[PDB]
Amino acid sequence: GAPPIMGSSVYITVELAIAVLAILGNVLVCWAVWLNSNLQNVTNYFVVSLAAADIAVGVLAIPFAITISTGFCAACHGCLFIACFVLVLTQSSIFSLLAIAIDRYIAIRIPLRYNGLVTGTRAKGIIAICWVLSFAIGLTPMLGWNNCGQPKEGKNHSQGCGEGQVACLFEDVVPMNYMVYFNFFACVLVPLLLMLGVYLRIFLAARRQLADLEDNWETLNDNLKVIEKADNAAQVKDALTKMRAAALDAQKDFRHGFDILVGQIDDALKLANEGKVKEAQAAAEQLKTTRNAYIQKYLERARSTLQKEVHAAKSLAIIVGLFALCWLPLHIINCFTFFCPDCSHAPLWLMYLAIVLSHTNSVVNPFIYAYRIREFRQTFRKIIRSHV
Numbered sequence: 001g002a003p004p005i006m007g008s009s010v011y012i013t014v015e016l017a018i019a020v021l022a023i024l025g026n027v028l029v030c031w032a033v034w035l036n037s038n039l040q041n042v043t044n045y046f047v048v049s050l051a052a053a054d055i056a057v058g059v060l061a062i063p064f065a066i067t068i069s070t071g072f073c074a075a076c077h078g079c080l081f082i083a084c085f086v087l088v089l090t091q092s093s094i095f096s097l098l099a100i101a102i103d104r105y106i107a108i109r110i111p112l113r114y115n116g117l118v119t120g121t122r123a124k125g126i127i128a129i130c131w132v133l134s135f136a137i138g139l140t141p142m143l144g145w146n147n148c149g150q151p152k153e154g155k156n157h158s159q160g161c162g163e164g165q166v167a168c169l170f171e172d173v174v175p176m177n178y179m180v181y182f183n184f185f186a187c188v189l190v191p192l193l194l195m196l197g198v199y200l201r202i203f204l205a206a207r208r209q210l211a212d213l214e215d216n217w218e219t220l221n222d223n224l225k226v227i228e229k230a231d232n233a234a235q236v237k238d239a240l241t242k243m244r245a246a247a248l249d250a251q252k253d254f255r256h257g258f259d260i261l262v263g264q265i266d267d268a269l270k271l272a273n274e275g276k277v278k279e280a281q282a283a284a285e286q287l288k289t290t291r292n293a294y295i296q297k298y299l300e301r302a303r304s305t306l307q308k309e310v311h312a313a314k315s316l317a318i319i320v321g322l323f324a325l326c327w328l329p330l331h332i333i334n335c336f337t338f339f340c341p342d343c344s345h346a347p348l349w350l351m352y353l354a355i356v357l358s359h360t361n362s363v364v365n366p367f368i369y370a371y372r373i374r375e376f377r378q379t380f381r382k383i384i385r386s387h388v
C-alpha cells in the first residue's frame with residue numbers, strides 16, 4: 001500500500017483548514033455578543049459557551065488530533081489527555097445545547113416569570129458547573145477506565161517507545177466500552193433525545209397558545225353575531241356572560257383596551273338584566289369599535305411574538321440536528337467496532353473522514369446564526385465592514 005505520509009498530509013492539511021475556520025467563525029460570534037447589547041441575553045451566553053468550546057476545538061482539539069494520528073511514543077496518561085480533551089469539548093457543547101433548549105422552553109411556557117427565574121448570574125453559574133462536569137465526564141478515562149494496564153506490546157517495541165510509554169493511538173488507550181456505553185449512549189444520545197423532547201414541547205406550547213388566541217377571537221365574533229340576531233334580553237345575557245369571561249381570558253395602548261371592552265360588556269349586561277333588549281344590542285355593537293382600535297392590535301402582536309419564537313426555536317433546533325449529523329457517524333463506527341467483533345474494522349480512510357466530519361461542526365454554527373438570526377447577521381455586517 002501507499003506511503004503513510006501522503007494520506008497523512010491530506011488529513012493534516014484538511015484539519016488545519018477546519019481549525020482556521022472554527023477559530024475565525026466563532027471569534028466572530030463572541031465579538032458580536034460583546035459589542036451588541038441586543039445580543040446580550042441569557043440565551044446567547046450559552047451560545048458564547050458553545051462558541052468558546054468550538055474555538056477550543058480549533059486551538060487545541062485539532063492539534064491534538066494531528067498529534068495522535070502519528071502514533072508517537074508517549075506516556076499513557078499523557079496520551080489519554082490528548083485522546084480525551086475533545087470529549088470535554090463535546091460534552092460542554094451537549095450541556096450548552098441542552099441549556100438553550102430548556103431556556104427557550106421556560107421562555108414560552110412562563111414568559112412573565114422568565115426574567116425573574118432566568119438571570120445572567122444564574123446562567124453564568126450553570127456554565128461554570130457544566131464546564132467542571134464536562135472535564136469530569138470527558139476525562140473519566142484518566143481516572144482509571146483505560147487500556148494503559150494492557151498495553152499493545154508489539155506496537156510499543158516496534159517503534160521503540162520508552163519504558164512506561166505506549167504508541168499513542170486512540171483505540172489502544174481509550175476503551176471502546178467507555179466510548180459506546182458511557183460516552184455515546186449515556187452522555188450524548190440521552191441528552192440529544194431529551195433535547196428533541198424539549199423542542200417538540202416548545203412547538204406544542206406554541207401551537208396550543210396560537211390556538212387559544214384563535215379561539216378567543218372567534219368566540220368574540222360568534223357571540224357578537226348571537227346578540228345581533230337575538231329574540232329576547234335573556235339570550236343577550238347568555239352571549240354577554242360568555243363574552244365577559246373570554247374578555248378576562250385574553251386579558252391575562254394595551255390595558256386601556258380591555259378596560260373599555262369589559263366596561264362596554266358590563267354596560268350591555270346591566271341593560272340586559274333590566275329587559276332593555278334593543279339598548280343592549282346597540283351597546284354590544286359599540287364593542288366593534290374597541291375590537292378594531294385595541295383588541296385586533298393585541299392579537300396581531302401576541303401572534304407574531306409566538307411566530308418569532310417558533311422561528312427562533314427552529315433555528316436553534318437545526319444546530320442540534322447538525323451536531324447530531326456531524327457526530328453520529330463516528331459514534332456509529334464505534335458501535336460497529338464494539339458490537340460486531342466478526343465484522344472487519346472500518347477502514348483507515350473512513351475513520352479519518354468521520355473525525356474530520358465531527359470537527360467541521362465547529363465551523364457550522366456561525367453560519368446558521370448569520371442566515372437565521374437577523375440580529376447576528378446585522379452585527380456580523382457592522383463588524384466586517386468597519387473592521388477591514
Ligand SMILES: CC(C)CCC[C@@H](C)[C@H]1CC[C@H]2[C@@H]3CC=C4C[C@@H](O)CC[C@]4(C)[C@H]3CC[C@]12C
Nearest residue numbers: 060073074075076077078079080081082165168
Ligand atoms: C495552556 C494551553 C494553551 C497549553 C496546553 C498544554 C498542552 C499542549 C500539554 C499539557 C499536558 C501535555 C502532555 C503531558 C504528558 C505527555 C506525555 C509525554 O510522554 C509526551 C507528551 C505529553 C502527551 C504532553 C503533550 C502536551 C500536553 C497535552
Ligand SMILES: CC(C)CCC[C@@H](C)[C@H]1CC[C@H]2[C@@H]3CC=C4C[C@@H](O)CC[C@]4(C)[C@H]3CC[C@]12C
Nearest residue numbers: 324325328329330332333336343344345346347
Ligand atoms: C447520521 C447518518 C448520516 C450516519 C449514517 C451511518 C453511517 C456512518 C454508517 C452507514 C453504513 C455503515 C457501515 C456499514 C458496514 C461497515 C462494515 C463493517 O465491517 C465495519 C463498519 C462499516 C464500515 C459501517 C460504518 C458506519 C456506516 C458507514
Ligand SMILES: CC(C)CCC[C@@H](C)[C@H]1CC[C@H]2[C@@H]3CC=C4C[C@@H](O)CC[C@]4(C)[C@H]3CC[C@]12C
Nearest residue numbers: 189328331332333335336337338339340341343
Ligand atoms: C436513535 C438514533 C438516531 C441513534 C442511532 C442508534 C444506534 C445506537 C444504532 C443504529 C444502527 C445500530 C447498529 C446496526 C447494526 C449492528 C450490527 C450488529 O452486528 C451489532 C450491533 C450494530 C453495530 C448496531 C448497534 C447500534 C446502532 C449503531
Ligand SMILES: Nc1nc(NCCc2ccc(O)cc2)nc2nc(-c3ccco3)nn12
Nearest residue numbers: 086169170171179330331334345348351355
Ligand atoms: N474510534 C476512534 N478512533 C480514533 N482514532 C484512531 C483511528 C484508528 C482506528 C483504528 C485503527 O486501526 C487505526 C486508526 N479517534 C476517535 N475519536 C472518536 C470519537 C470521539 C468522539 C466520539 O468518537 N473515536 N475515535
Ligand SMILES: CCCCCCCC/C=C\CCCCCCCC(=O)O
Nearest residue numbers: 007008011014348349352353356357
Ligand atoms: C464535510 C467533510 C469535509 C470534507 C473533507 C475532505 C476529505 C479529506 C479528509 C479525509 C480523507 C481521508 C484521508 C486519508 C486517511 C488519512 C491517512 C492517515 O492519517 O494515515
Ligand SMILES: CCCCCCCC/C=C\CCCCCCCC(=O)O
Nearest residue numbers: 059060063064066067068070072073
Ligand atoms: C500562541 C501561543 C504559541 C503556542 C505554540 C506552541 C508551539 C508548539 C506547537 C507544535 C510543536 C510540536 C513539535 C513536535 C515535536 C517533534 C518531536 C521530535 O522532534 O522528534
Ligand SMILES: CCCCCCCC/C=C\CCCCCCCC(=O)O
Nearest residue numbers: 023058059060063064066067070072
Ligand atoms: C491561534 C493560534 C494557536 C494555534 C497553535 C496550534 C498550532 C499547532 C499546529 C500543529 C500541531 C503539531 C503536531 C505535532 C505532531 C507530532 C509529530 C511527532 O512528534 O511524531
Ligand SMILES: CCCCCCCC/C=C\CCCCCCCC(=O)O
Nearest residue numbers: 343344345346347349350353354357
Ligand atoms: C461527507 C461526504 C460523504 C460522501 C462519501 C462518504 C462515503 C462513506 C459511506 C460508506 C463507506 C463504506 C465503506 C466500505 C466498508 C468496507 C468493508 C470492510 O470493512 O472491509
